[PDB]
Ligand binder design. Structure first.
Ligand SMILES: CCCCCCCCCCCCCCCC(=O)O
Ligand SMILES: CCCCCCCCCCCCCCCC(=O)O
Ligand SMILES: [Ba+2]
Ligand SMILES: [Ba+2]
Length: 129
């Protein structure tokens, strides 16, 4: 249950640059850049379910650690990949040349996505139960 909970974005870096590079429609970039998105994670052993809500955009994903999964990304593109744990508190995957690291430290989840020189970093904080 390490990751389980509800978290909301506190701050992020390089949203616009990153989203434009990956092919997000620009009117979604514009509507989305200042939204404080909410992430709901449910972990049960190796099985994870996560929902990410950013203003009427709702992305629901599931995966088993160390198994092939199909992740729906920012644009709607579904990608086959493997998510690994690197310790109890860290989720790592790569897709479309993007390295995604999700790290929980107490109540703060730091998500770092790097595509080439672009490092997109999001900091979220637990919000209740
Ligand atoms: C309908 C207007 C809202 C605009 C849609 C917002 C789309 C922006 C997507 C940002 C989500 C960040 C990617 C998830 C990172 C992660 O949790 O792994
Ligand atoms: C929509 C982008 C796909 C995300 C791929 C990463 C899969 C493992 C991480 C799942 C937990 C995500 C936690 C959300 C953190 C955040 O909203 O910034
Ligand atoms: Ba823990
Ligand atoms: Ba991969």
């Amino acid at each position: 249950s390490s990751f389980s909970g509800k978290y909301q974005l506190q701050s992020q870096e390089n949203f616009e640059a990153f989203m434009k590079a990956i092919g997000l429609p620009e009117e979604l970039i514009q509507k989305g850049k200042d939204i404080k998105g909410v992430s709901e994670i449910v972990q049960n052993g190796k099985h994870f379910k996560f929902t990410i809500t950013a203003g009427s955009k709702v992305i629901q994903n599931e995966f088993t650690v160390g198994e092939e999964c199909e992740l729906e990304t920012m644009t709607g593109e579904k990608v086959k990949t493997v998510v690994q744990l690197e310790g109890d508190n860290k989720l790592v995957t790569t897709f479309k040349n993007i390295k995604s690291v999700t790290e929980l430290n107490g109540d703060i989840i730091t998500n770092t996505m790097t595509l080439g020189d672009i490092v997109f970093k999001r900091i979220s904080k637990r919000i209740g139960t």
